[PDB]
Design a protein around this nucleic acid. Sequence first.
RNA 1: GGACGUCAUGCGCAUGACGUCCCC
RNA 2: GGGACGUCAUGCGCAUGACGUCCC
Lengths: 647, 641
Amino acid sequence: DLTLRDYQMEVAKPALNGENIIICLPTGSGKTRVAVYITKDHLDKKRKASEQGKVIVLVNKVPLVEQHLRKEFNPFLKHWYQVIGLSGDSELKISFPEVVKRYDVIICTAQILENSLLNESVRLSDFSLIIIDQCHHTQKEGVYNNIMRRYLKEKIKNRPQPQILGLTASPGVGGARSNSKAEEHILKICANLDACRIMTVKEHASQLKNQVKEPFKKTVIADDKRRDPFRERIIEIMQDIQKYCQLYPKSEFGSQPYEQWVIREERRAAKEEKRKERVCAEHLKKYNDALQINDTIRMVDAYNHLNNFYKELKRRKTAESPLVSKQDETDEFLMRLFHAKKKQLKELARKPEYDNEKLMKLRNTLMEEFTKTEEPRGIIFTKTRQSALALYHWIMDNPKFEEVGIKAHFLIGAGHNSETKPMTQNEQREVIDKFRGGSINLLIATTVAEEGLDIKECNIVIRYGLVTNEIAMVQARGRARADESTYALVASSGSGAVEREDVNIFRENMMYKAIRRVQEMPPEEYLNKIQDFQLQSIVEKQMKAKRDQRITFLCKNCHKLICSGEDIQVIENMHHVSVKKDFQHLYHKREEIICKDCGQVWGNMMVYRGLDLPCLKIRNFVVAFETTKEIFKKWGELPIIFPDFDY
Amino acid sequence: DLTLRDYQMEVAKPALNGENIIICLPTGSGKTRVAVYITKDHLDKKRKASEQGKVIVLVNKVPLVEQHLRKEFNPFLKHWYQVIGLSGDSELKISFPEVVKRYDVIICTAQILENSLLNESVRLSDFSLIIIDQCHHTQKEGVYNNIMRRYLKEKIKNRPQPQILGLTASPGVGGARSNSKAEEHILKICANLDACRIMTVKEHASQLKNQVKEPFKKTVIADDKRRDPFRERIIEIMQDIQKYCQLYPKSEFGSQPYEQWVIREERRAAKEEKRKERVCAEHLKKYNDALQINDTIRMVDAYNHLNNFYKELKRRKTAESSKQDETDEFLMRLFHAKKKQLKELARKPEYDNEKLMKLRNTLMEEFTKTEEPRGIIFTKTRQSALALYHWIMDNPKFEEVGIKAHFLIGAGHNSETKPMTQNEQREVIDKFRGGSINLLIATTVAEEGLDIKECNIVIRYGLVTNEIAMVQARGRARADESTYALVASSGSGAVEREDVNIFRENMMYKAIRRVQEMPPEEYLNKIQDFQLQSIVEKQMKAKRDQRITFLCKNCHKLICSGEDIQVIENMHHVSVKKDFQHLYHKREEIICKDCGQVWGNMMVYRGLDLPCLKIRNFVVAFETKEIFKKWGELPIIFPDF
RNA sequence: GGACGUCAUGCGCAUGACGUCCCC
RNA sequence: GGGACGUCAUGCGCAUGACGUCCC
Ligand SMILES: Nc1ncnc2c1ncn2[C@@H]1O[C@H](COP(=O)(O)OP(=O)(O)O)[C@@H](O)[C@H]1O
Ligand SMILES: Nc1ncnc2c1ncn2[C@@H]1O[C@H](COP(=O)(O)OP(=O)(O)O)[C@@H](O)[C@H]1O
Ligand SMILES: [Mg+2]
Ligand SMILES: [Mg+2]
Ligand SMILES: [Zn+2]
Ligand SMILES: [Zn+2]
């Protein structure tokens, strides 16, 4: 039984009458339900005018396909039309061109559609309604914009195109600081979705107000005026290393500019055969990491970060199943250095009084807010993955949290480009569905929790010194819309984060005023501006179309002669491997492939057709041409390509 | 008779007792008078302890040497000590090492002292008090910081140094947006001047308040909702050119990103022998210039900017004693077709910019409050100063109500507008205090340092820079019933940029209040750390600093080899081949014979008429091609003629 | 005329963190 | 495991304009 609330109608009306539009409805309003109502209405009128009704709903996240089916599309359309959900995760034995022709309502991740459009074929004439979910991403080189680039390309050259629905809560300002540049970004994503209007709940605003409960805002600041024993004890150690190698920073200890400098320094050193310098630079990064860990997490984690790093070196340096020797002077210096000051750090880390202030501010904000209701739920937005896994263990090892009600769990990302190891797509469901059950009470999450996914309503949402953009700001507030909701920001004065959130509050307020002006804009003006942005949106692709249209291997640490370019061959289209048979002797094995001479990590052992072969990563070698030298980050940056192992 | 007011004392006290400090006193308080009182007090105590008293007062501007002498230092110290003023403008036949030894009070531009320190020699032991004027410049690779880098270098290695006075009004925040990074910048320039404290008028704040009259603030915004006929008529013309060459922008018309794009495009085109493209890109810049001129100045100036540009091409293309390409004849005709329309449209006063009517309105009311009022208009570009002058001239109602105006621009030779002489700036500024000139239309030049008369109105005409210059500009208006106005348009972003500076200024006062309240063990340890890394910042620059054919950019002809070019003096590069006489033409200026592109200018050197060549106008071809901006960017150096 | 520095604005590139999608 | 995209922070470079200095 497919109703709409009065505000939902007001926003939908022009889409029901065929106009391409963007829809701005807050989190908890039910923007997807408006999509459903529009697909049906659109499709019914094509039946009743004896015509084609094919509707494709694009998303940016695999769980949103199956979530949009179960909870919105199937219940209201499966029994009248042919509905399907697609993704890369889907195991179908049917090509996408077929799925177009066999189905009426196609929900899928936008890249599935773009993959087909790349190239019997698929094209945008085949659909009559394209609904883009979270359309603020229709921007730059995003998939959504590449789709729309084609649509717009056809429009201008035509002198039979589908209808386009944009779905979002807040379109954004695109990092701008001026009300002029707010307009310009709004108009730009209006222009990318060829919208005849951006659409907001004006006439039924009072009704919307009651549906979504706006939370109570706080900014709990931490003036770090405590003594910082752990900091001081580390900066000592770092200065002892900086003298040893004679590499002096232009930057504060425990900060980004230091981290950038010390990484540039490790590279340069490695390129110039200066082991002593790079090894110290490598170690100096880990110490710098431990400082900023001490700023945010508990200091036992900072300690552990170092302890584990020096534990790893014991395995890689100590031999097993005769040499000049792996253990260098520089290595033995740094190892001893840490082993000397270790006990001090450990016994200092277990003093709870010198743990970070932010943690006591977090503790305080939790304890009061988890004692207002008998069944409360909440989220902590930490910045790094490690800080999620740590704050979990912080809550575990702390009986007062558990006693008052808090049973917590971390919720991180999926990627394989982090030093912390991810969660599976499936493992995220396991938590999030436990969260709505009440099994898990408190999500400690990275950005992952901010957009899209259906997470239970929250009584508290804590941004633990995390600020990103205006969009994510307002998304995070949307996650807390239960009774007596609270949106807290727990930063320190030294961060700059209180002032960055305050700029986002200014930006958000610009965004509402840029929407109010593009709406009030006379149509001759609006038309002429949108056409101009679209004309230059196509030219932005032409400049990238010119951009895109454009030896020996040595151990970074000890500079040994190991491999030629001819010795390396690709497996599949990614795993590069060596084929020489002297090569057996020049590496060692641990639990992982390390240099025999120096114990530097080279890669890992794999199996391929019952053969134990060595994988080599480009991280860990200096490439020598002929003379110029280089460290490349990923294999694709090299100039010559290697042949496949087996032809 | 050398007094101090009660606030001036409070601020000076620790300097009188020998402590290195920075002094923060508003514009109109008399910070220089505190320098005078400190030099005398310092020098008197060295006489009376039978010892060396040598004091060097560094400045950043040549007029401030002669101004500090006349109006502060000589009247109170010439009759008791040996006072002198130095600069690069000074015509002395005496080396600086001598001037050190012969004089007690040495006022000079800081580079004079650094030149000597570079290298009987000069060094910082020779002075006992160094007073740095406008010490907020003691930053980065500024001269003031290179001086202090040496001072700090000696300090750390010593295990007999002078006292150091920092003079400023507002030290700044250094572009920061966080109260954490405000502290960090304050501490950094505290650390560069080795100050024991930043010093502000707290105990006698009420008295200071009365001395300096704080102006009434306004932000007169212009919602440009008018029709813009001139704009539309130009964008038409630019689209006609963009189709012709097939170079399409990724940017708005009449803006910076367009200007950057269209300059990158002219270069690329010139490197790749694509005359058609570059010539259009060159012309497209001039059209883009005329749009942003239309945004700020009157539109007759935008028209004139184009007319004069196409007039120049008539001289360079028409022969005397084929040059005209298809692309050239296309663009020329194109302008000649749409010309009369632009001219007759430009003389319609109703379609001139709104900001000008907002300016007009803000002037007319504020120049009718007092019978003798004075004021300043801070425009952005030099052209917009010279234009707003002519705007006020050609407008009898300004003159009738009292306004007699004049422009006040810069000195440099790196602008498309031609400068004022050091002397010409005095001629205006001293006329301004006389009442001969009523209204200065100035670039940034008027904001810092120079003694300009007090103002009833100061207008920032869509100009915003940093917090420092903001507060400096407010300082220029401290007469009775003073007003500080900002006249920007909603499309600028400038109202919001000034609002960030207002936030930044407020951070600055709070960062000062915290470094002052900071316990000394903490303050010491932070200053020593910034100084330690300030020296390392020089070491990273000390590694940075320690690191073929010539073809006409337009027509790509073979003109000169590297061997054909020889330097005159250490700057004017010139060709010596004698086929070379034929390949250029002469106008009123050296142009290509084939295409009429400007190559340089004719000079005389030992009675020889020789051709100067600028690197702007040639594609350098190795064996790769390149356009270099200035000769020093090339890899091989040429011998002297 | 040359060199150097500072400020504002805009553009581009790099590093790190976070997230996503597609493919094997 | 590879490729692409986006977001945040930081750093670097180039362009335009304005200003200053020093040496010619
Ligand atoms: N017209 C309606 N009548 C009744 N319930 C509705 C209606 N629209 C939406 N809902 C309910 O609200 C839910 C939408 O919540 P949510 O997904 O948070 O909104 P959004 O799509 O804005 O994020 C639906 O799943 C449904 O349970
Ligand atoms: N203690 C004082 N007694 C008398 N006049 C003073 C005193 N201090 C300053 N002045 C006057 O103030 C003028 C200097 O002010 P100004 O240069 O505008 O301030 P600043 O040095 O802050 O730029 C001098 O010309 C002088 O006549
Ligand atoms: Mg929903
Ligand atoms: Mg003064
Ligand atoms: Zn090795
Ligand atoms: Zn030529």
